[PDB]
Amino acid sequence: AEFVPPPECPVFEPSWEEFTDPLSFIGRIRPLAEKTGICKIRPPKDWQPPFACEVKSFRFTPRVQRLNELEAMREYTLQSFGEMADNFKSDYFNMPVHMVPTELVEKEFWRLVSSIEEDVIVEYGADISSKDFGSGFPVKDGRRKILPEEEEYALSGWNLNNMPVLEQSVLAKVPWLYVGMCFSSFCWHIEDHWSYSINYLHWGEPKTWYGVPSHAAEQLEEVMRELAPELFESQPDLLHQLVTIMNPNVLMEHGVPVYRTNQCAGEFVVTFPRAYHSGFNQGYNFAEAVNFCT
Ligand SMILES: O=C(O)c1ccnc(-n2ncc([C@H](OCCN3CCCCC3)c3ccccc3)c2-c2ccccc2)c1
Numbered sequence: 119a120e121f122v123p124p125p126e127c128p129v130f131e132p133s134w135e136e137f138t139d140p141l142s143f144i145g146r147i148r149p150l151a152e153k154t155g156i157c158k159i160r161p162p163k164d165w166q167p168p169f170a171c172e173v174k175s176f177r178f179t180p181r182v183q184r185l186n187e188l189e190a191m192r193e194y195t196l197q198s199f200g201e202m203a204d205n206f207k208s209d210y211f212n213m214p215v216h217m218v219p220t221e222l223v224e225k226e227f228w229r230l231v232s233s234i235e236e237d238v239i240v241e242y243g244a245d246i247s248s249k250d251f252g253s254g255f256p257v258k259d260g261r262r263k264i265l266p267e268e269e270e271y272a273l274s275g276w277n278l279n280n281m282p283v284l285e286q287s288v289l290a291k292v293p294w295l296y297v298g299m300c301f302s303s304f305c306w307h308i309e310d311h312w313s314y315s316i317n318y319l320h321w322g323e324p325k326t327w328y329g330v331p332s333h334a335a336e337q338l339e340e341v342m343r344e345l346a347p348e349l350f351e352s353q354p355d356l357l358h359q360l361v362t363i364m365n366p367n368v369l370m371e372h373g374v375p376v377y378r379t380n381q382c383a384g385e386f387v388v389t390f391p392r393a394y395h396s397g398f399n400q401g402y403n404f405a406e407a408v409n410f411c412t
């Protein structure tokens with residue numbers, strides 16, 4: 119029948135005192151958040167970083183995504199991609215883009231993923247390096263001067279360019295950008311080296327997430343292998359993770375705990391070590407993400 123939304127993941131609204139530095143805050147919420155895999159963090163109301171990408175020269179060629187590709191077995195500016203994205207969604211649902219309920223897009227997305235009668239194809243501006251046109255956060259680069267009202271965000275610990283990224287090893291990365299449209303998605307995966315990830319939605323329509331706690335990681339991998347196509351079941355995890363598309367209800371039917379959330383503009387999503395996650399975009403939006411170490 120229809121998609122059954124998983125339970126909501128934890129949402130934290132830290133005070134200005136708790137918001138002082140992310141690593142200590144993430145360490146404190148860990149007893150709860152590591153049991154849900156993902157969590158959402160809403161900064162205080164007055165914490166509003168300005169968007170710092172060079173919008174004039176921002177150009178990219180998004181990847182083509184066919185939603186039902188497993189069942190079946192153009193260069194844009196930010197403005198032109200947004201026009202394409204809004205036109206697609208308003209045409210698909212026959213209503214203004216901001217009036218489409220998040221539950222309907224979610225229900226339609228998972229129906230289209232398993233549909234053999236309807237081939238829906240979207241585009242995703244994914245894995246755009248922040249080195250190309252700058253980070254969405256203000257940065258003391260020198261490649262783009264910052265206003266005085268911007269400096270606190272250039273120095274903030276929640277600025278994804280200021281997250282610790284070095285892992286201590288016996289030898290003695292930068293954020294990535296995602297320009298989304300309706301139904302553009304990221305399949306089930308964990309980060310390299312089981313690292314944390316922090317994700318910030320700069321603006322636009324919500325990004326819908328699904329997360330699995332790390333204690334159920336082997337359960338998910340067993341379900342994924344049992345139900346993956348026979349040609350992909352034997353592939354190494356790093357390659358299989360390119361096509362690990364699975365309805366959350368299938369995992370839940372196999373006893374795997376799954377949590378969801380709608381990440382709205384200005385909110386963070388943190389994924390914990392070895393927490394499998396997947397999701398899709400409700401519409402035209404802009405996200406920034408990085409892996410970090412504790
Ligand atoms: O869309 C998002 O909002 C999102 C949300 C959560 N997580 C990710 N992550 N997180 C790590 C990766 C990862 O790529 C990121 C770095 N990327 C690696 C190759 C060279 C270029 C840079 C990835 C990609 C495919 C499968 C599994 C993980 C990805 C990713 C990237 C592109 C498509 C699908 C997933 C994205």
Ligand SMILES: [Mn+2]
Pocket residue numbers: 307308309315389395
């Ligand atoms: Mn990820």
